[PDB]
């Protein structure tokens, strides 16, 4: 899209602390509810996750009006390199509940 560097790390850090993010199909909403703190319009939330599909890192289902997304493991080894994270940090995907 236009891809500001502050908001991409703002959406990736939640998209890596859990393996999901739950945007809704309306571009005319200037406030994503689950971030709600760095004045993202969810254009940036859409058009990031468009790019994550085309590399094959994320997955999506298109509910009634909601997009759901999921982390493939090739996305996790992509986000642990792009967020510069050491190879012990894993999301709530693998085993965080017993």
């Amino acid at each position: 899209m236009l891809m500001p560097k502050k908001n991409r790390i703002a959406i990736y850090e939640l998209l890596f602390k859990e393996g999901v993010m739950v945007a809704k199909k309306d571009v005319h909403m200037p406030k994503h509810p689950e971030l709600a703190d760095k004045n993202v319009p969810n254009l940036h939330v859409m058009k990031a996750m468009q790019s994550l599909k085309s590399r094959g890192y994320v997955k999506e289902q298109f509910a009634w009006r909601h997009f759901y997304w999921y982390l493939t493991n090739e996305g996790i080894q992509y986000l642990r390199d792009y967020l510069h994270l050491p190879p012990e940090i894993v999301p709530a995907t693998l085993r965080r509940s017993r």
């Binding site: 199909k25 005319h28 009634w64 009006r65």
Partner: protein, 55 residues
């Protein structure tokens, strides 16, 4: 873009703002009881809502 007047017409009162939560249409939708579904849309899920017919 040029955000001052991209989406500047007021989507407020009137059928330029009501939409189907389920189908994404603006025509014929039912705003009774806070449903906001498309009328064509309403028939599918009406058994799942809990709306029975006469039998």
């Amino acid at each position: 873009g040029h955000q001052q007047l991209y989406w500047s017409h007021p989507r407020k009162f009137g059928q330029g703002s009501r939409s189907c939560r389920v189908c994404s249409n603006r025509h014929g939708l039912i705003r009774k009881y806070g449903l906001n579904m498309c009328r064509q849309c309403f028939r599918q899920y009406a058994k799942d809502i809990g709306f029975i017919k006469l039998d």
